From a paper:
Calsequestrin (Casq) is considered to be the major Ca2+-storage/buffer protein within the sarcoplasmic reticulum (SR) of both cardiac and skeletal muscle, where it resides as either its cardiac (Casq2) or skeletal (Casq1) isoform. When studied in solution, Casq polymerizes as free Ca2+ concentrations increase and depolymerizes as Ca2+ concentrations decrease. We also showed that both glycosylation and phosphorylation alter the physical characteristics of Casq substantially, including its oligomerization and Ca2+-binding capacity.
Calsequestrin crystallized in two forms: the low-Ca2+ forms of native and recombinant bovine Casq1 crystallized in the absence of added Ca2+ in the crystallization buffer; the high-Ca2+ forms crystallized in the presence of 2.5 mM Ca2+ (17× molar excess of Ca2+ added to solution). The lattice packing for both low-Ca2+ native and recombinant established a typical weakly-interacting linear polymer with D2 symmetry, a pattern also found in previous Casq structures. In the case of low-Ca2+ native Casq1, the glycosyl groups on the four molecules in the crystallographic asymmetric unit modeled reliably into the corresponding electron density map as GlcNAc2 for two monomers, GlcNAc2Man1 for another monomer and GlcNAc2Man2 for the remaining monomer.
Numbering used by the authors:
A (entry chain A), B (entry chain B): 3 to 348
The structure:
Amino acid sequence: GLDFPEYDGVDRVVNVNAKNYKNVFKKYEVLALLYHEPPEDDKASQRQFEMDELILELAAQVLEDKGVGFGMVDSEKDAAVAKKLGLTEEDSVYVFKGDEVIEYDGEFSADTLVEFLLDVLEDPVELIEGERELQAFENIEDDNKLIGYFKNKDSEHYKAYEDAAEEFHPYIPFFATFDSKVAKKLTLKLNEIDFYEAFMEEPVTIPDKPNSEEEIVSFVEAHKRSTLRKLKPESMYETWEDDLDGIHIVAFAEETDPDGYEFLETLKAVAQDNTDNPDLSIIWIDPDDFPLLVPYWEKTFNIDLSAPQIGVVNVTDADSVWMEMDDEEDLPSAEELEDWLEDVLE
Amino acid sequence: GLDFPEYDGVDRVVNVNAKNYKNVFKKYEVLALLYHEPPEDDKASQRQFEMDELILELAAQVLEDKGVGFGMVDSEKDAAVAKKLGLTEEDSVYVFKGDEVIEYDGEFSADTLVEFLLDVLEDPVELIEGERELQAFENIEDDNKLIGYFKNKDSEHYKAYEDAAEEFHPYIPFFATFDSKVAKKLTLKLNEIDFYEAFMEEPVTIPDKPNSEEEIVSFVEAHKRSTLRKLKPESMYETWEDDLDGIHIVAFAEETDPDGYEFLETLKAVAQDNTDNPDLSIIWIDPDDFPLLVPYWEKTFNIDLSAPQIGVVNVTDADSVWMEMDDEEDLPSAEELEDWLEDVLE
Ligand SMILES: *[C@@H]1O[C@H](CO)[C@@H](O[C@@H]2O[C@H](CO)[C@@H](O)[C@H](O)[C@H]2NC(C)=O)[C@H](O)[C@H]1NC(C)=O
Ligand SMILES: *[C@@H]1O[C@H](CO)[C@@H](O)[C@H](O)[C@H]1NC(C)=O
Ligand SMILES: [Ca+2]
Ligand SMILES: [Ca+2]
Ligand SMILES: [Ca+2]
Ligand SMILES: [Ca+2]
Ligand SMILES: [Ca+2]
Ligand SMILES: [Ca+2]
Ligand SMILES: [Ca+2]
Ligand SMILES: [Ca+2]
Ligand SMILES: [Ca+2]
Ligand SMILES: [Ca+2]
């Protein structure tokens, strides 16, 4: 029978240098550039560099037909190109779509990169027309989302909303509808924009509508750090490095597992009860999203990720404390969680 | 501060040859061997071979602490070793756990390989004691599962049950209880074994209890092909190559998406209504499980995997037919699906 697709071994990652970098940007709508330090001469360093190149090669093969290019910029050999393009963070990926530039800070894998770039290709604002499109919108809960009601696609207040959407694309989805019926179900006046914090039932409306590009961006910046945030591969590093006071409240819960789903519903509740605390942000990690880190997590934290967990992690040395839970008795409720949090921090 | 783990570039994949293969099998509890053809000389083939070596290297690093080794066996240079070990399927992975041998036939990626090998390390039979462990068992539906009720692990009929579990480890989970309360909830007599076909509400009891090792293996062999099957990466190739009559009924549905969950519930219903048809076998593909194949699938089948799909695929040329659904009307019902498949097949 016909075989599944496979990596064909063809090289597609452009070696970007001073003479071709201008042609490359014109060739591709979306361009992903790995800004890297010159590979050390030792064996292991040469292998690490090799792994990262092939990951780009595999991604380039997948996204060749959709017009996504992949390039490498050497921090010394191509230093002038780094200067003209603004590549500062060493050993990191930059994504270019038309004008805007995205400083990728997520997992460096073929799966995650292709997913992220496919989201990048999409327009910054997604429209909602039928009730099924609204019902899909109302079901999002692991991303902060915005919804606005505007008269037409040509409205001046919509372009400001769209321009603001470009500042957070694709991490934070921006939705808009021109159907008053959908707007009525959401209690959205004309040109009003609602911000739904992740895992929160009731939204927050942006004051002083209509809103300009700057008013929207300022609002999102002040509200993007949700009280409960999910560790997603597209942004795991940005999220983890955003520690409040040198520690993270980490909770492991497998959504598909019954014990994991129940424990998550408790977390959502604790977050809803304490959503106004400006210093509280809990990281939810679904171990199913990071299969390669599970053994490392069980080893470092001395926990069994087959059962739900919650703890405090020192981001400096990975020192940790974890709430103990009985495998026979029922899982702790919001009351027990709120009390366990207050004690370990006091 | 502290960095996430990374590939360190150290080589851990053993070059298995006639002089070391016996020492290797004594070193590791679980050993995965890539039986591979000698690498071709061209550039592209040299990259493909390189890609596959690093994927093994990445898994070798993740599972070093848990005692899992990784080796490569060349079909010509190590042909005598392949002879002694029984490595016939070229360019494929063989996993050895003590005595048993598992002929891996799944996705060749680090994520899937580590997930699979971690399941191999687990014992073949998982026990159920409390109420929470029971409810976790009852939630499984994408795997065929077995459950038996015995007196204790020293029982003769439990040891026969455990020996049979090794023949299907870890693809088919074998569960067992010694708790009479749990047995009552499952309507299980003593030494009775219930077989829950995937996506089915009611089990099938193995007749002529108590059952021997061979009676169980035979029963599972005759029931392994569930009427509805999920394409899982650990076994995607085995599933796909098991064409009914040179064709597959393929259904795409993203479980987390509301429209995909409903269409899956409809699929579950259609499967339950025809579970006694020996020829009907539907493959369910969750596009979230195969992010690198989504562009290839949308291009080949001319479908949009953001909406649920169902169709018939010729396994020889990837020719296909797909049920058109309106993006504004409600999703098709079980009857409408039964009406579309029987129509295209007649
Ligand atoms: C699936 O497609 C294959 C070809 O891609 C079909 O096989 C051909 O069938 C015709 C007559 O049916 C023969 O003349 C050709 O020689 C066959 N070619 C090959 C390569 O097998 C097959 O019939 C199709 N299956 C269905 C169910 O339509
Ligand atoms: C984290 O660990 C460091 C030592 O590595 C220690 O100095 C610091 O105080 C710890 N932080 C907290 C919040 O305990
Ligand atoms: Ca370069
Ligand atoms: Ca997103
Ligand atoms: Ca309002
Ligand atoms: Ca205003
Ligand atoms: Ca909040
Ligand atoms: Ca070898
Ligand atoms: Ca399994
Ligand atoms: Ca029964
Ligand atoms: Ca008998
Ligand atoms: Ca059946």
